[PDB]
Design a binder for this molecule. Structure first.
Ligand code: 1WL
Ligand code: ZN
Ligand code: ZN
Ligand code: ZN
Length: 298
């Protein structure tokens, strides 16, 4: 059978919050079967735990934020993307502050931490959510869709008209049958438009942001000296973001996500909308791994 997995060891890193600029301690820990991913604010007294589930998502304007009452964990998407890509079912994530460290702006440092901690197979069947019927949400010209697919695929299109984006592909469709999340998606850095970053900074926001953790573009050029890690790094990051947001379903997906200029808000709306309609999905397991359309071989 395809088994659930967790980490073999506890592992740690430090960084700064993108929004807050606040130095933060991060800890990843193994967790028992059927735990899912659980975030814990260890700085608070008492310690506050927030399961990484769609129903716990609060604000989604800049990043995906988990909330429990007045307590938040901000910017969970890049870490969750790594958890999803490596097929980690169960883990505890401890934080000393209200935001996951931005690290290098991608999911790479988290893939690094997870792989370094080691992967532990557990004695329980891994559960998958299979899309049975196409479900969509939109807001204006933005659209997010789940489509049935015998495997796992993420497609995305962005549509920027700024000169800096002219001629760029602005589209990608990744079938993970033959694409490596680690090698071809995970290291895609977040990006920001200079005008927007200036506005945030003017309000004392985005304090942790720098060219060392984000691709910065003005109307016309990429400001980063070294260019891009992937030729299509911008759309690859949108795909990364979607994979992280999608993992709030609590299980790996058998199906396709299609995004069109979509963001965390639409992503979460899509999740809640899917979850609510029981005719559009089912939970499946695989007693024989070679019968599965998906593989988390390592
Ligand atoms: N000298 C100097 C100093 C500081 C800086 C800087 C900076 C920065 C930044 C920044 C802020 C917000 C975002 C963000 O919203 N990115 C989105 C996705 C997204 C949404 N809209 C655009 N992108 C995202 O990846 N969410 O997961 C990303 C980056 C630059 C130069
Ligand atoms: Zn423009
Ligand atoms: Zn992102
Ligand atoms: Zn909703």
């Amino acid at each position: 059978m395809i088994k659930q997995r967790t980490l073999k060891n506890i592992i740690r890193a430090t960084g700064v919050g993108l929004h807050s600029g606040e130095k933060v301690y991060l800890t990843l820990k193994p967790a028992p079967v059927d735990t899912g991913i659980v975030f814990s604010r260890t700085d608070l007294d008492p310690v506050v735990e927030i399961p990484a589930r769609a129903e716990n998502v609060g604000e989604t304007t800049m990043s995906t934020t988990l909330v429990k009452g007045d307590v938040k964990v901000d910017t969970v998407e890049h870490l969750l993307s790594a958890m999803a890509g490596l097929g980690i079912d169960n883990a505890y994530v401890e934080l000393s502050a209200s935001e996951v460290p931005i690290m290098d702006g991608s999911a790479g440092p988290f893939v690094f931490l997870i792989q370094s901690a080691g992967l532990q197979e557990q004695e329980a069947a891994k559960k998958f959510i299979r899309i049975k019927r196409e479900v969509s949400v939109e807001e204006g010209d933005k659209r997010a869709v789940f489509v049935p697919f015998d495997g796992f695929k993420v497609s995305f299109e962005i549509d920027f008209d700024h000169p800096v984006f002219r001629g760029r592909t602005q589209q990608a469709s990744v079938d993970f049958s033959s694409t490596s999340f680690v090698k071809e998606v995970s290291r895609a850095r977040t990006f920001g438009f200079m005008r927007d970053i200036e506005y945030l900074r003017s309000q004392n926001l985005a304090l942790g942001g720098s060219v060392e953790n984000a691709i910065v573009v003005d109307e016309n050029r990429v400001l980063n000296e070294d260019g891009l890690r992937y030729e299509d790094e911008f759309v690859k990051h949108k795909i990364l973001d979607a994979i992280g947001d999608l993992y709030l379903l609590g299980n790996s997906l058998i199906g396709e996500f299609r995004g069109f200029k979509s963001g965390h808000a639409l992503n979460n709306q899509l999740l809640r909308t899917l979850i609510a309609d029981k005719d559009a999905w089912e939970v499946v397991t695989f007693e024989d791994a070679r019968t599965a359309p998906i593989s988390y071989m390592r």
